[PDB]
Design a protein around this ligand. Structure first.
Ligand SMILES: [Mg+2]
Lengths: 212, 235, 222, 244, 250, 233, 231, 240
């Protein structure tokens, strides 16, 4: 798995791979590692797939109940903390979770919280989680700027997943892109890594090591 | 004294029959179901001019497709609303879908008779639950503290209910538009209210398939009141 | 020490068509190197035009199918005989499975039917309830033998149009129910040849707007 | 069933009063008078034992004045047995606080805790309230010397001088007349004993009918000493002030 | 089933009276006279063995009960209520004291524990107060000899000498005239027997009178030898013969 | 979680044209010690069902009492207890199957393998298996433990599929069962010569045969076998 | 009088007034009819509306594929009791792979209602039920009273004016019991029976509610234009 | 446990225990709340039947629930402490989980919820307390003033009074408070609050307590002399 999310001028980019493996066996190439918690909040799926799926759609239910009671959009801080407090109750039981809770509100602006099954809750600008996280971090760190355009930020997230997909054996399949704005997230398509790799190799002149 | 869950010689639960009297003292709430939507309207009835009337919340959202109006001891409705909202959201979590208006209403009504010596008495509030689902379309239910709920084409609850219901008897037909229903609620509220009806002491709302449940702005309601006055002066 | 889990072998296969869906499974039930039964139905009609199979440990498989069938019944009672849509059934099954997160049903569950637009639908679950809608999914013992074949013959992966040499992919043309059944049968014939736990019989349940139909085929009994 | 026999101890009257609290207060009005007077350099607690006997072992007897900790004491008015239940709970609270924060419990926090317990018996449980009123005399380094009172309702208030038990109307008038803010402990001792001597229902005020205590910073340097007076010491202070 | 009486059966009346406590005290008043006298070197507690029938063996009915080796108790009022209180008083002396401090409780604290049990029956749900007044006599190292009275309310008072029950008013007056702070144990026993004779109608002898003392340590009653610090119980119940011997010098 | 102590070995069974046959030896082993020689491991329920049990005997006896209790309970307020509302094999099995799976799910299993053999109200043959894991399956032939490995192959030569059942008579079926029992006696170290056999027929009802013995055994060829390779004498 | 404050109190003549008051709630309820032949069992129920804007209160509840009931009295109590039946029907199927006998279903309802009549704090159920079902001993019809008394019958009626329908069935006994293999004629007899309990009002399309179960007929409820055939 | 239904309906549809709880509020000392343009002022009556009181330590009538919200009350004093404690705990619990302090409306809704719960729970009586809850929402400069009562109903008020003779001071406020132009400054708001209490109080000495709450957790209680200056200026203008 490779999942990333980073804050920038235009909001948040969320990018993930699509591969699921059981040992060396590739179980699926069409997995959704971005949970659509609600139209404004996104969560990434790493570690236990069920644990992420189950508890983040549950989180969506809690967020819905909040805004029904309080007549106001839940903050990313509050939404993330509901999840982190929950998993912290289960600490020791064997939940496996590494997720970025991503959202864009009035009071906070674009906000990303890394939430962990050990109970860790970190606010940050750039997060990268999974077996291919180190590969994606490299591309991110060397190319990231706050004043990235929405177009360039989307490409950076896509390219960083590709970097991981290539090297990390347990990452690949396809790239899912999301752009999170204040008015909600916008889906930016599924991109097959096989086709994307050759396309990027040619247009970018990268991956000279690989014969195409 | 006597049991809380005691039957009268006529075969009625004393406490349930007494809670129905408390609801008669409550402010008027009216619901009208049409094929273009369901309209919910209430009398706010502020006890003093210093009470900021917009803080009176007698119309409430349960889900995007279900709204609710109350009459009687309105404090008792809060836990009912909470349960309703929880039921709506929980069902969506379990089944990845909207919950049926009837099923929601049934879940609320199951609380009603859970009293004895569970809570210590029945609820002292009636609810008009209005909503839409794909199976049965636009629906309006009347949930009582007896645990019984009736579906209605139109219904009034509260102090001016029997007078309003007689008026709804004559006025309702199966081809009402949403705009016709809005004015009709305003007309009947104005009739049964002690004080003169305006945008501050009365409130409108509706539920449509497209936009979902919406409480009306005081500016929006004010225009419908002015539209009402003119059409009544028109003959 | 007592081991509450066991492996009853078996292999199941779900394929979603354009206006239909098939859920197939071999009828062999085993422990270790012994055959328990040459015909032990594994794919079940659960009502509301939904078919289900929970492959792996048969006791947990039978328990889950039973509880889901029960959930369909109570869905009718509680919600005015409303039809349980395939997406709603899928979410319900997630909660059944995740309910036993810390003592899981040791099964790989697949359901099949039609979605609310009448198109073919297959959902695939892990043992603890993570699920996804899929076009094509083999589960069980010979899943690794079947899925690559399906990637190639259903989705036309690695196949390109002659003359172009890798430039134009083979177009993803829609398969008929007769065409799918051929691929299912050949999948199981091949799996039977190369996997010891696969054989005896193949039972396919086909779901359309007209209802659920069954087809049975013999497999090699060695 | 059982409902038939339920007195319903926790209900309002039509006037909005708590029947049992009001009746418990009526009970307390027949109890021996207890007086607390707060001075700048200490607090006095004076209390009258109820119609005693010559055969009562006074030197080992304690019905009015109790020690909660080294800094806080109480004077009791009402059912002695009820008071001891509450006193033990208070002593435990003071120790819990000391164990938790490693500091002696502030007087008001202890008073609030006991007063909250009394309150509970008036709102839930269906039990009768505690027929007890306390005068709390205590010291802490925040507010210094403090006098409080609590009654069966669970309501507590702060005082410069206060009485509970019998003849509180007469006693409170006499205190209000002769009390001044710059008063000292030795003067307050005299006022307390003079007030009891006038409000007592007995023919004369003697040492065997009294319990007496002082909380003084009259302890060697910056610290506080509690003094529960002995029968002979009460006899001496009665002669000193010129009552016997 | 379930005890559905979770509410108080003793409540304040408008006048401020706790009716059930007053009525319990009325039951104590009807009870047979018992008394207690404290001397300089001991305490004596005494009562009449009012035999319900001459066929009954009144020796099997113990009105005077050992609570600890140095503490004894006697009562006036309802016998059964007393018996269960003695059982609870004995157990609480162990559970809330001896099993913690490795020694028997001092008289005042045991009395305090008994009082607490009686107080709780005055406030707890679905019970009546105990219909007894107890006189508890005892000794301990730091407080010396002591005598306490415990009422149905849970209130307790220390006494030099006192009486409870039937003829208490007359008996207390008799004790006031005789008591002084220089009495020896034998003198207190002599006064106890004199006082008790006034309230007794019929037979007055060692078989109709129950009398015990808290006095010197009784190593003969310890049951073992070898430990110097263990010197035996101070509680001793007088025999029928021992009482009659002192009735000749009466 | 436990370990089995006193154990019973193979239960074997098969369907034939008019009903079912089931058999099991009368041994209660204590490890390698052949401790108890008079243990009945076929327990009839009514006149239409026979439950065969292998594995832990103490758990067998418990199950035996549950079935006895089940018959009692079914008769309560049931005028048709000996007619339309009598216990069916399918009812008895489903009950046991529920219990077995519940017990494994509490990590405290009944350490058994069970075969419920019987005939339904409509004359249908009932033969289904359940074990300590709550695993269930049905087949024309069913066998537990060693029986699964040695009896089934032989019994499957008679009834290899569903269509062979109407072609199989009770004489052929019983013969095959009795032969299988002999084979198990030759080869299962935890078996005994004495066994019980039960036939449940839709026409002739329940025939319960006790004190049967393995006979017609071949041992004479043993005299010629000498040494382990090279030895001649 | 002095002995009707709760269900735990016998009167001097040995009566339980709270139970009798609960029985009274049934008489106030709308009429419902039950009748059966040897092949089928039928429920016919007159539904009651609050007014002309309101819906007609549903009277019939399905408990299983082979069992269901009609109610008269407090509808929430019927929901509780029908839910209990659903569970007991379901327990029998899941645990014993066995359809719950109608007679045994009655025994369970009796015992559940009985516990509410002997204990303090509770109250009797304020509803009467007519349970029909088809099991291994053919068609069945039961009448449940919240006193606990359950009675197996060929036909019956409960609710307001139920005596008229009950007398009709008592006359027609020999005719309708013989209506085997003809569902429409058995329903006709039920619709003609319930008609004997009508005054002022008549059977309209949203007024009438019919249910049927039989040999090869799952428990199915008919409402709306599905019962226009029988009006 | 004690399960007795104390709060129950009467034939006329009234819950007398809730209504008798309001009678306890009527007996309680008067409390008043007035919100200006950029402040809220809470006035409270202190009955002068109790002198020789120690005002340093005696429980003050206005209590801080958080640094930005305050609560005053009329009715049973012991009962009010239980509501105050619960509110204070909930305020910290809200900060802990939501990472934001409570809104005044939320805190009101919670207290009102607690009060309601005690009107249909077994073995408990309703609170003999009505509250005035005032403050400013986090990062908000709009004044907030809410009222609760034993039944559990709550609502927002431009100005409101509760307790004994609250009918009289509400009369005063209804004619003296203009919604189109509320007290523009702290002075004007405090003045109007003191004036309203002077209709009922008796002597303007130690009988009036005033607490001013401003935005951004700016809460201060006025002293005797500061209030006495308002009392002096009001009557000197009145002599005309
Ligand atoms: Mg094979």
């Amino acid at each position: 798995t490779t999942t990333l999310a980073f804050r920038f001028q235009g909001g948040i980019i969320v990018a993930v791979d699509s591969r699921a493996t059981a040992g060396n066996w590739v179980a699926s190439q069409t997995v959704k590692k971005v949970i659509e918690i609600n139209p404004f909040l996104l969560g990434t799926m790493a570690g236990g797939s069920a644990d992420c799926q189950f508890w983040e759609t549950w989180l969506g239910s809690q967020c819905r109940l909040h805004e029904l009671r309080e007549k106001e959009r839940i903050s990313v801080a509050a939404a993330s903390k509901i999840l982190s407090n929950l998993v912290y109750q289960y600490k020791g039981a064997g939940l496996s979770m590494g997720t970025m809770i991503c959202g864009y509100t009035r009071k906070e602006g674009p906000t990303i919280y890394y939430v962990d099954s050990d109970g860790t809750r970190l606010k940050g600008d750039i997060f990268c989680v999974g077996s291919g996280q180190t590969f994606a971090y490299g591309v991110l760190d060397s190319n990231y700027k706050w004043d990235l355009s929405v177009e360039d930020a989307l490409y950076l997230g896509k390219r960083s997943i590709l970097a991981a997909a290539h090297r990390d054996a347990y990452s690949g399949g396809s790239v899912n892109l999301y752009h999170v704005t204040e008015d909600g997230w916008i889906y930016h398509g599924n991109h097959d890594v096989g086709e994307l790799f050759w396309k990027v190799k040619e247009e970018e002149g990268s991956f000279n090591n690989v014969i195409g | 004294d006597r049991g809380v869950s005691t039957f009268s010689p006529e075969g009625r639960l004393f406490q349930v029959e007494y809670s129905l009297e408390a609801i008669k003292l409550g402010s008027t709430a009216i619901g009208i179901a049409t094929k273009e939507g369901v309209v919910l309207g209430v009398e706010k009835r502020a006890t003093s001019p210093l009470l900021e009337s917009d803080s009176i919340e007698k119309i409430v959202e349960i889900d995007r497709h279900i709204g609710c109006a109350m009459s009687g001891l309105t404090a008792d409705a809060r836990s009912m609303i909470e349960h309703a909202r929880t039921a709506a959201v929980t069902h969506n979590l379990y089944y990845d879908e909207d919950i049926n208006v009837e099923s929601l209403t049934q879940s609320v009504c199951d609380l009603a008779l859970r009293f004895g010596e569970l809570m210590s008495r029945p609820f002292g509030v009636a609810l008009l639950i209005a909503g839409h689902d794909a199976d049965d379309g636009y629906q309006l239910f009347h949930a009582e503290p007896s645990g019984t709920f009736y579906r209605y084409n139109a219904k009034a609850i509260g102090s001016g209910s029997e007078g309003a219901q007689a008026e709804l008897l004559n006025e309702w037909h199966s081809s009402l538009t949403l705009k016709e229903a809005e004015l009709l609620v305003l007309k009947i509220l104005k009739q049964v209210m002690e004080e003169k009806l305006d945008e501050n002491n009365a409130q409108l709302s509706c539920i449509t398939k497209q936009d979902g449940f919406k409480i009306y702005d005081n500016e929006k309601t004010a225009e419908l009141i002015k539209e009402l006055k003119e059409k009544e002066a028109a003959e | 020490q007592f081991n509450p889990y066991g492996d009853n072998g078996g292999t199941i296969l779900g394929i979603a068509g354009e206006d239909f869906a098939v859920l197939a499974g071999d009828t062999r039930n085993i422990t270790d190197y012994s055959i328990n039964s040459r015909y032990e139905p594994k794919v079940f009609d659960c009502g509301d035009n939904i078919v289900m199979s929970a492959n792996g440990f048969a006791a947990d498989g039978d328990a889950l199918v039973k509880r889901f069938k029960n959930s369909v019944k109570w869905y009718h009672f509680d919600h005015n005989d409303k039809k349980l849509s395939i997406n709603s059934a899928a979410r319900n099954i997630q909660h059944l499975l995740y309910g036993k997160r810390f003592f899981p049903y040791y099964v790989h569950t697949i359901i099949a039917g039609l979605d609310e637009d009448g198109k073919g639908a297959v959902y695939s679950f892990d043992p603890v309830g993570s699920y996804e809608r899929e076009q094509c999914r083999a589960g069980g013992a010979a899943a690794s033998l079947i899925m690559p074949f399906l990637d190639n013959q259903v989705n036309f992966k690695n196949q390109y149009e002659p003359g172009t040499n890798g430039k134009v992919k083979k177009p993803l043309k829609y398969l008929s129910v007769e065409e799918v059944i051929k691929l299912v049968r050949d999948s199981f014939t091949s799996a039977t040849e190369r996997h010891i736990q696969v054989g005896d019989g193949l039972e396919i349940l086909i779901v359309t707007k007209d209802g659920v139909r069954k087809e049975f085929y013999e497999l090699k009994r060695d | 069933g059982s409902r038939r026999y339920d007195s319903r101890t926790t209900i309002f009257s039509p006037e909005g009063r708590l029947y049992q609290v009001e009746y418990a207060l009526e009970s307390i009005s027949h109890a021996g008078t207890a007086i607390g007077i707060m001075a700048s350099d200490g607090i006095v607690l004076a209390a009258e034992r109820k119609v005693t006997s010559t055969l009562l072992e006074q030197d080992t007897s304690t019905e009015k004045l109790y020690k909660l900790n080294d800094k806080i004491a109480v004077a009791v008015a009402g059912l002695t047995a009820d008071a001891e239940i509450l006193i033990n709970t208070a002593r435990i609270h003071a120790q819990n606080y000391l164990k938790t924060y490693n500091e002696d419990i502030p007087v008001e926090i202890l008073v609030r805790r006991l007063s909250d317990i009394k309150q509970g018996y008036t709102q839930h449980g269906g039990l009768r309230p505690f027929g007890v009123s306390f005068i709390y005399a205590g010291y802490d380094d925040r507010y210094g010397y403090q006098l409080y009172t609590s009654n069966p309702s669970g309501n507590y208030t702060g005082w410069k001088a206060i009485s509970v038990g019998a003849n509180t109307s007469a006693a409170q008038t006499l205190l209000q007349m002769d009390y001044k803010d710059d008063m000292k402990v030795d003067d307050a001792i005299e006022l307390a004993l003079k007030t009891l001597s006038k409000t007592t229902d007995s023919s004369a005020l003697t040492y065997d009918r009294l319990e007496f205590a002082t909380i003084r910073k009259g302890a060697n340097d910056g610290e506080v000493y509690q003094k529960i007076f002995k029968p002979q010491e009460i006899k001496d202070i009665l002669v000193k002030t010129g009552i016997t | 089933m379930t005890d559905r009486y979770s509410f108080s059966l003793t409540t304040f009346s408008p006048s401020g009276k706790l009716g059930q406590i007053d009525y319990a005290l009325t039951a104590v008043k009807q009870g047979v006279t018992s008394l207690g006298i404290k001397a300089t070197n001991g305490v004596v507690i005494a009562t009449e063995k009012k035999s319900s029938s001459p066929l009954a063996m009144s020796e099997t009915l113990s009105k005077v009960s050992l609570l600890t080796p140095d503490i004894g108790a006697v009562y006036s009022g309802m016998g059964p209520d007393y018996r269960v209180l003695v059982d609870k008083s004995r157990k609480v002396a162990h559970t809330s004291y001896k099993r913690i401090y490795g020694e028997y409780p001092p008289t005042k604290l045991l009395v305090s524990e008994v009082a607490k049990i009686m107080q709780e029956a005055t406030q707890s749900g679905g019970v009546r107060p105990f219909g007894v007044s107890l006189l508890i006599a005892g000794h301990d190292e730091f407080n010396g000899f002591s005598l306490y009275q415990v009422d149905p309310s849970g209130s307790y008072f220390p006494w030099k000498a006192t009486a409870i029950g039937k003829g208490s008013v007359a008996a207390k007056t008799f004790l006031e005239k005789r008591w002084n702070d220089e009495l020896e144990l034998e003198d207190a026993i002599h006064i106890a027997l004199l006082t008790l004779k006034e309230s007794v109608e019929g037979e007055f002898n060692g078989d109709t009178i129950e009398l015990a003392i808290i006095g010197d340590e009784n190593p003969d009653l310890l049951g073992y030898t070898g430990i110097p610090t263990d010197k035996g119980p101070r509680f001793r119940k007088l025999t029928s013969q021992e009482i009659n011997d002192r009735l000749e010098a009466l | 979680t436990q370990q089995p102590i006193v154990t019973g070995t193979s239960v074997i069974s098969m369907k034939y044209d008019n009903g079912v046959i089931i058999a099991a030896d009368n041994l209660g082993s204590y490890g390698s010690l052949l401790r108890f020689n008079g243990v009945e491991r076929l327990i009839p329920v009514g006149d239409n069902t026979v439950v065969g049990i292998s594995g832990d005997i103490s758990d067998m006896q418990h199950i035996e009492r549950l079935l006895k209790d089940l018959v009692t309970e079914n008769a309560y307020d049931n005028p048709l207890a000996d007619a339309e509302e009598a216990l069916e094999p399918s009812y008895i099995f489903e009950y046991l199957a529920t219990v077995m799976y519940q017990r494994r799910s509490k990590m405290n299993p009944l350490w058994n393998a069970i075969i419920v053999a019987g005939v339904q109200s409509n004359g249908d043959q009932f033969l289904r298996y359940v074990n300590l894991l709550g695993v269930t399956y049905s087949s024309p032939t069913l066998a537990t433990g060693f029986g699964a490995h040695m009896a089934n192959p032989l019994l499957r030569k008679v009834v290899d599929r569903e269509s062979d059942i109407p072609k199989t008579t009770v004489q052929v079926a019983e013969e095959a069962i009795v032969n299988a029992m002999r084979v198990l006696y030759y080869r299962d170290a935890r078996s005994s010569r004495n066994f019980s056999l039960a036939i449940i027929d839709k026409n002739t009802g329940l025939t319960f045969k006790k004190n049967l013995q393995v006979e017609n055994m071949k041992w004479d060829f043993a005299k010629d076998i000498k040494g382990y390779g090279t030895q001649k004498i | 009088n002095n002995y009707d404050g709760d269900t735990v109190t016998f009167s001097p003549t040995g009566r339980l007034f709270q139970v009798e008051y609960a029985l009274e709630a049934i008489k106030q309820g709308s009429v419902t009819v039950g009748l059966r032949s040897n092949t089928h069992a039928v429920l016919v129920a007159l539904k009651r509306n609050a007014d002309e804007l309101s819906s007609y209160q549903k009277k019939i509840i399905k408990c299983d594929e082979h069992m269901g009931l009609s109610l008269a009295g407090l509808a929430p109590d019927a929901r509780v009791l029908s839910n209990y039946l659903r569970q007991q029907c379901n327990y029998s199927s899941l645990v014993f792979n066995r359809k719950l006998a109608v007679e045994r279903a009655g025994h369970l309802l009796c015992d559940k209602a009985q516990k509410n009549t002997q204990s303090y704090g509770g109250r009797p159920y304020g509803v009467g039920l007519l349970i029909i079902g088809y099991d291994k001993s053919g068609a069945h019809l039961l009448e449940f009273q919240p006193s606990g008394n359950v009675t197996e019958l060929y036909g019956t009626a409960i609710g307001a004016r139920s005596q008229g329908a009950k007398t009709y069935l008592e006359r027609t006994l020999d005719t309708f019991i013989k209506i085997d293999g003809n569902p429409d004629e058995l329903i006709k007899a039920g619709v003609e029976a319930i008609s004997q309990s009508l005054r002022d009002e008549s059977l309209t399309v949203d007024n009438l509610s019919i249910a049927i179960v039989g040999k090869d007929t799952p428990f199915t409820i008919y409402d709306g234009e599905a019962v226009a055939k029988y009006i | 446990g004690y399960d007795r239904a104390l709060s129950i309906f009467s034939p006329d549809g009234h819950i007398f225990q809730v209504e008798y709880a309001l009678e306890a509020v009527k007996r309680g000392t008067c409390a008043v709340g007035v919100k200006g343009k950029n402040c809220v002022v809470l006035g409270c009556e202190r009955r002068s039947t109790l002198k020789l009181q120690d005002t340093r330590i005696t429980p003050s009538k206005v209590s801080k629930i958080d640094s930005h919200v305050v609560l005053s009350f009329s009715g049973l004093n012991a009962d009010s402490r239980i509501l105050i404690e619960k509110a204070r705990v909930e305020a910290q619990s809200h900060r802990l989980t939501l990472e934001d302090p409570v809104t005044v409306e939320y805190l009101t809704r919670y207290v009102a919820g607690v009060q309601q719960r005690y009107t249909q729970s077994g073995g408990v009586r309703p609170f003999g307390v009505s509250t005035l809850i005032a403050g400013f929402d986090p990062r908000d400069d709009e004044p907030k003033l809410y009222q609760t009562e034993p039944s559990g109903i709550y609502s927002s008020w431009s100005a409101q009074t509760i307790g004994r003779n609250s009918k009289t001071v509400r009369e005063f406020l209804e004619k003296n408070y203009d919604r189109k132009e509320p007290p523009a400054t702290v002075e004007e708001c405090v003045k109007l609050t003191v004036r309203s209490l002077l209709e009922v109080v008796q002597t303007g000495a130690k009988n009036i307590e005033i607490t001013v709450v401003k935005p951004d957790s700016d809460i201060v209680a006025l002293s005797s002399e500061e209030i006495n200056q308002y009392v002096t200026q009001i009557e000197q203008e009145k002599q005309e």
